[PDB]
Amino acid sequence: STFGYVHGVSGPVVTACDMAGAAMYELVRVGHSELVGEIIRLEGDMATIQVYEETSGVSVGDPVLRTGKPLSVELGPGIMGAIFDGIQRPLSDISSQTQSIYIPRGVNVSALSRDVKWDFTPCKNLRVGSHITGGDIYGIVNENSLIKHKIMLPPRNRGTVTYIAPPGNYDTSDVVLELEFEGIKEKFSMVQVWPVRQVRPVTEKLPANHPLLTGQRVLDALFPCVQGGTTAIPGAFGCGKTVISQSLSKYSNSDVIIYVGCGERGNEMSEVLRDFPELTMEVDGKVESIMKRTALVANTSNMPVAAREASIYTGITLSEYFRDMGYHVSMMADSTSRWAEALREISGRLAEMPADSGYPAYLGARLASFYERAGRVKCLGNPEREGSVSIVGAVSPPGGDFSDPVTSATLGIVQVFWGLDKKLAQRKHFPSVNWLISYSKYMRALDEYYDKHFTEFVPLRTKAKEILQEEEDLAEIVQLVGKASLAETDKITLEVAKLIKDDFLQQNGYTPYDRFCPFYKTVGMLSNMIAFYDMARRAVETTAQSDNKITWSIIREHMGEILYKLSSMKFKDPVKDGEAKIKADYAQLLEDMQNAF
Amino acid sequence: NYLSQPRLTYKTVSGVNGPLVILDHVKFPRYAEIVHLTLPDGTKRSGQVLEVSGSKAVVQVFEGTSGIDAKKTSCEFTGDILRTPVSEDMLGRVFNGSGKPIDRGPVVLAEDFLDIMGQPINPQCRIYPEEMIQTGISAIDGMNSIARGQKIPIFSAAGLPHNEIAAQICRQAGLVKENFAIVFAAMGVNMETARFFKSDFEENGSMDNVCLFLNLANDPTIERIITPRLALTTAEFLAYQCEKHVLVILTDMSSYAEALREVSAAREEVPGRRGFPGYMYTDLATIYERAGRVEGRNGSITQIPILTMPNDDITHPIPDLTGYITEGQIYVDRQLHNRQIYPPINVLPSLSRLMKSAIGEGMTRKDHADVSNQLYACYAIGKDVQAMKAVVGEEALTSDDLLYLEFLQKFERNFIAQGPYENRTVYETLDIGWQLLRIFPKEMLKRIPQSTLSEFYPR
Amino acid sequence: QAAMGSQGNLSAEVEQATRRQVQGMQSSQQRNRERVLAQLLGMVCDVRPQVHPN
Amino acid sequence: EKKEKQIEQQKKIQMSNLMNQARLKVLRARDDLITDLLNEAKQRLSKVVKDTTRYQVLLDGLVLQGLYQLLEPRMIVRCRKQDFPLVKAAVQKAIPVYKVATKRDVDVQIDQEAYLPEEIAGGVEIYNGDRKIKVSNTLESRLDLIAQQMMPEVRGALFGANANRK
Amino acid sequence: FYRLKKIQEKKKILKEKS
Numbered sequence A: 001s002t003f004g005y006v007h008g009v010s011g012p013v014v015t016a017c018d019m020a021g022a023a024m025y026e027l028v029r030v031g032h033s034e035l036v037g038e039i040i041r042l043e044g045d046m047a048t049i050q051v052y053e054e055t056s057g058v059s060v061g062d063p064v065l066r067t068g069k070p071l072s073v074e075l076g077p078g079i080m081g082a083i084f085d086g087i088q089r090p091l092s093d094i095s096s097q098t099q100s101i102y103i104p105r106g107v108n109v110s111a112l113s114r115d116v117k118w119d120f121t122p123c124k125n126l127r128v129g130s131h132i133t134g135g136d137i138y139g140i141v142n143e144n145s146l147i148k149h150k151i152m153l154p155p156r157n158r159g160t161v162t163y164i165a166p167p168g169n170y171d172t173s174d175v176v177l178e179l180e181f182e183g184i185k186e187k188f189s190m191v192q193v194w195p196v197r198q199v200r201p202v203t204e205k206l207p208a209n210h211p212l213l214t215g216q217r218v219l220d221a222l223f224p225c226v227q228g229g230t231t232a233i234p235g236a237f238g239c240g241k242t243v244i245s246q247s248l249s250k251y252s253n254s255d256v257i258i259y260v261g262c263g264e265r266g267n268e269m270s271e272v273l274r275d276f277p278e279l280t281m282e283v284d285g286k287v288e289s290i291m292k293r294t295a296l297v298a299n300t301s302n303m304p305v306a307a308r309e310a311s312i313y314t315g316i317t318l319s320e321y322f323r324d325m326g327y328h329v330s331m332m333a334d335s336t337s338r339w340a341e342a343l344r345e346i347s348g349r350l351a352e353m354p355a356d357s358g359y360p361a362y363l364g365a366r367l368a369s370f371y372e373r374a375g376r377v378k379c380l381g382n383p384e385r386e387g388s389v390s391i392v393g394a395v396s397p398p399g400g401d402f403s404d405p406v407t408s409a410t411l412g413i414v415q416v417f418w419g420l421d422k423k424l425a426q427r428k429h430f431p432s433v434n435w436l437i438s439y440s441k442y443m444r445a446l447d448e449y450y451d452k453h454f455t456e457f458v459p460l461r462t463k464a465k466e467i468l469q470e471e472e473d474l475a476e477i478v479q480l481v482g483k484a485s486l487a488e489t490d491k492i493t494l495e496v497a498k499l500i501k502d503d504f505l506q507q508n509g510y511t512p513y514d515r516f517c518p519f520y521k522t523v524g525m526l527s528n529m530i531a532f533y534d535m536a537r538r539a540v541e542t543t544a545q546s547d548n549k550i551t552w553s554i555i556r557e558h559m560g561e562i563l564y565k566l567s568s569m570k571f572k573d574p575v576k577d578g579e580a581k582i583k584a585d586y587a588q589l590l591e592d593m594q595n596a597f
Numbered sequence B: 001n002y003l004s005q006p007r008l009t010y011k012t013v014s015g016v017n018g019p020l021v022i023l024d025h026v027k028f029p030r031y032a033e034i035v036h037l038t039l040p041d042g043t044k045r046s047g048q049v050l051e052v053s054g055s056k057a058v059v060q061v062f063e064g065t066s067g068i069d070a071k072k073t074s075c076e077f078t079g080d081i082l083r084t085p086v087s088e089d090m091l092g093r094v095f096n097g098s099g100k101p102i103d104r105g106p107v108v109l110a111e112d113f114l115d116i117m118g119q120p121i122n123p124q125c126r127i128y129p130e131e132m133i134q135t136g137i138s139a140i141d142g143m144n145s146i147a148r149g150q151k152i153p154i155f156s157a158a159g160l161p162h163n164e165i166a167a168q169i170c171r172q173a174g175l176v177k178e179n180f181a182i183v184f185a186a187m188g189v190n191m192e193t194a195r196f197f198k199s200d201f202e203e204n205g206s207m208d209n210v211c212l213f214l215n216l217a218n219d220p221t222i223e224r225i226i227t228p229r230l231a232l233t234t235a236e237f238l239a240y241q242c243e244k245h246v247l248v249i250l251t252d253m254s255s256y257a258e259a260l261r262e263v264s265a266a267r268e269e270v271p272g273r274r275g276f277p278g279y280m281y282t283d284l285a286t287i288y289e290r291a292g293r294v295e296g297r298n299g300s301i302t303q304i305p306i307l308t309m310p311n312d313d314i315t316h317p318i319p320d321l322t323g324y325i326t327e328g329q330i331y332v333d334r335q336l337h338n339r340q341i342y343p344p345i346n347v348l349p350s351l352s353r354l355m356k357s358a359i360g361e362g363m364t365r366k367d368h369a370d371v372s373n374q375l376y377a378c379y380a381i382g383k384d385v386q387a388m389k390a391v392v393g394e395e396a397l398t399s400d401d402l403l404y405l406e407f408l409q410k411f412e413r414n415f416i417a418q419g420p421y422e423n424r425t426v427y428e429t430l431d432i433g434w435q436l437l438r439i440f441p442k443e444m445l446k447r448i449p450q451s452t453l454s455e456f457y458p459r
Numbered sequence C: 001q002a003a004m005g006s007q008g009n010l011s012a013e014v015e016q017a018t019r020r021q022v023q024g025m026q027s028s029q030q031r032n033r034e035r036v037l038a039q040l041l042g043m044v045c046d047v048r049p050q051v052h053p054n
Numbered sequence D: 001e002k003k004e005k006q007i008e009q010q011k012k013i014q015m016s017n018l019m020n021q022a023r024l025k026v027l028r029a030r031d032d033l034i035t036d037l038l039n040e041a042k043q044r045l046s047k048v049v050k051d052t053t054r055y056q057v058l059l060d061g062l063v064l065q066g067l068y069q070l071l072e073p074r075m076i077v078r079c080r081k082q083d084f085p086l087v088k089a090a091v092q093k094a095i096p097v098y099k100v101a102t103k104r105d106v107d108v109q110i111d112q113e114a115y116l117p118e119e120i121a122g123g124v125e126i127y128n129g130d131r132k133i134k135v136s137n138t139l140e141s142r143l144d145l146i147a148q149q150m151m152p153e154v155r156g157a158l159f160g161a162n163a164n165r166k
Numbered sequence E: 001f002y003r004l005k006k007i008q009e010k011k012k013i014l015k016e017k018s
């Protein structure tokens, strides 16, 4: 059979009769406007289809044509600086082809433009007659001044080269390579079609060693992330789950960035494409905007719900595609809780039985099969490069409660957990990461990096996390008993920790100096606030009881100029690099001598 | 272009339970199709087709199934989806919840027929809201400033004056130093609530541009679903197709979702929290994200939806899900209403996400971004100090925290408390805000850098 | 005096602006009445029968 | 300040109530300009019913339009009393074209027990065999459908078009 | 309640065909 007939439509799902030779997760086109849908259940002759567009007006007599292929994306040049929807239709080309402001929900726009010409160059060390396997580079295309889009063979096939294209300008439809493999000759182009629900093949997984530098101080120091790791950001509304997402997409160490808006706001993706073409960064002494390494998968909350599933798998396929070139990809999914609400609404139409709080029983398997596509890993192919995929997925728990079937299922999968607090947002304490409940599991994986470049930082965070918990164990005493009955080794603990929460942990994202903090500034200003805690320890412990001693009341009136130096270490712009390391020690020599006097 | 085939009429109902009527032997039924039911006594009822399966079509009537026969009722299938007649003369009038005139008026002459579900805006051609709306209220304009094209709800409760501050921001809506067409959806309101909004818009002379849609509590609950849908597709017409700045006021949004729970529980759909459906986030976002402004047009649409949280709970499914879609909220509180503050606005759970682009040198002036963060920080510490003097004592606090006591009694009485008709400008608000920061020393204002302290704190 | 000037605000327009808007469109109705009725009556006689497209 | 502020409010309500009745009068005046346009259209369709050659070639397709939209084995034609010999040629002409497009075969009859009322201008109403499904294809039912879809066009072509669009 | 009512709705479906 070639095509089908609608039997019933109820919301997103469509039951289609006369559909016998159809496989699961095939792509179909239901209706006269050809709405893109995917088969999820079939009972003999009738198949059930979730539709990625609005089914409003679909009648029973509508045809459902089958494509014989799953939901896939086109991978090639024309993808950096672009913005797509869940099923990878380019939003910049969909608004010039129609000249409207809406998506006409019928349009089969090609994902990569078949008219724009790219300047292909060969591998230079790939002659005719050379053997070639799946996943090795056979050409270099410079998509921008920053991105060299390395053209690769698909991982399925292999052969012997019979024709390679000379260097010149080519479309995405021009034949570039011919491979004879059995004595069969298959043509190739600069685009390849890969299904989004299939994990990309790769040589072997690798442990992660290099950290991901987000730019925030509480994120880089206390709960560090690696490139190739999995991160989850839960939190209620107004906590700042997009300010962590925007500061990571602007100032991380990652080669390419993708940003998947899954059930997000419409204004928050328009916010991205405004300030990104003006924010330039410096890689080779040249300045180029960060939109040339950015690609957006925009599926807002107004857009249909089944495309939230497709926008997640579209992104992680683009994330794994630039992984294979040797780049260090970082993916931000916002929000993964809206993907979970999509699976609940689809399974409610199929009358499936629910797991805890409405969600289907296969919720934790969908999340596990998405976070496990991340990792630092040696790619397929002969030039022997290495790439990585970092996934930082925002979770939106209902009511700000972390006992949630989406949040608690996520915390069993991810390794880094940045718990955002609402009480830290009710006061203007940004970023709102709750230092008590947050954790990381790359600690043992990163200290082999930390005894090479910053050889003093691991004893620092062991004390800084001890001071912040010592404050919390005494904060319950003050609100019940009172501050006047404390000891002197505890009043120094509460004030140094208050200096840590105000200078080190608080960070204004829109000011010109704290919008990015390099790691020498992070280790630097933490090395002085803990040495000040250790120097004030000896003022209390060594002179303990006998003499009329330093009792910390004389400290806060005599160190009022020195405490003002400690509270102002955050004001060091990137207009100075070497001077900031000196002023970290120039503040320390004031700290060195004042304990003697 | 036009449907010209004659509509079919079926006398073939096969099941009716709850609000759902099940029609059999329908030939090619259509999803989301609108129908017309003719009762055996002659009253006409409309209905949407919510499920079709082969020859069967499950409709739901808007006015309820009370009296629907099995042998004698006749349903007529209008061959298109629910499209409302929208026009430019659909302005200056009062309509009911469904579609009909109220003030002894004609039906609209229908410049075009727009689908009430609309279609989502492409995010590539949706320009970010930048210009600021001066509402005349210091708690709004000073700390949580709204932009033109911003969705921002009023988080209220039962008994609090949310309708009074709704009419206030309508009279005083203006650009920071050609009027706003207000479309008003009244949903599940009392009669005295609808008379308050009618007599306020007929008082300030703005009723030549008011599009008031009223839907009282005696009107059926299934018509509350299509009530914001019709009130936003005229605002979509006036702003994207008629080039005019529109302010949409939705009330009560709690009465929308409680009416949404009744239809979902009757269809036996999967519940989320507290019995509300799982698709409540999507249904709330299909009427919230129809706001903002587009690139090729000079008109815009801003949304201020009023909702009353049940039992003062901000973690209820109503204000939690609307807090995840909108761009910051306004929290009118109850404990500030007992002290006879007329806007009882607790600024600590209030937010405006688009306030940062709407403040600055070109927008109002230099110190707006800095005095708002400092007034927020001194109110946050002084309220935690207020919970300490109630448990320990009024005298044994830190000497700095007695200034925090003196700040809070001057914050809640001079800064936010302004009266029902006083419309301060944004430059008046920052001038009153610096007077309350004057009682603090210069070096305790930590969130303000030393540069702009020199220009404003000695005065 | 204010109640006397307010009655001056009554008949000044309600007979001037309201009545000119009726006869202003009564003339515009009469100029275009026959072209509309020629197009509208033709569409009733343009019957064409397909069956569903299904 | 009670004697002055109340009469300033009551005058401002009175002024705003004047513009309401002025707007509603000119809007109701626009109703009767469309209402008689639909009324004189109802008269001018009756003149099409009077002459026979244009009315029957209308009635051939208008019976077939109800036939192709119902698609039943047995169908029942219900007509006006005067047009009964005219529909009998119209049904008999519409049989061998139904067998051309569709490949079932119809079994029409014409109900002599009940006719359309005399005030009905023209047209036909075609039922199914079980009296349950009905296609109302009269001239009052065909004028109403076209008048709904053309209210955008009979406003802009007949009054002034709005100066503010898109 | 939602799980147990869904079982009873499915139990009438199999009973009606059989």
Ligand SMILES: Nc1ncnc2c1ncn2[C@@H]1O[C@H](COP(=O)(O)OP(=O)(O)O)[C@@H](O)[C@H]1O
Binding pocket: A235, A236, A237, A238, A239, A240, A241, A242, A243, A430, A431, A507, A508, A509, A510, B351, B352, B353, B354
């Ligand atoms: N680093 C920061 N500096 C200053 N303000 C911030 C910072 N981070 C967050 N905010 C404030 O928090 C508000 C909410 O940010 P948002 O990302 O929208 O939280 P969420 O996405 O969880 O709803 C923002 O509008 C902003 O005013």
Ligand SMILES: [Mg+2]
Binding pocket: A241, A242
């Ligand atoms: Mg967000």
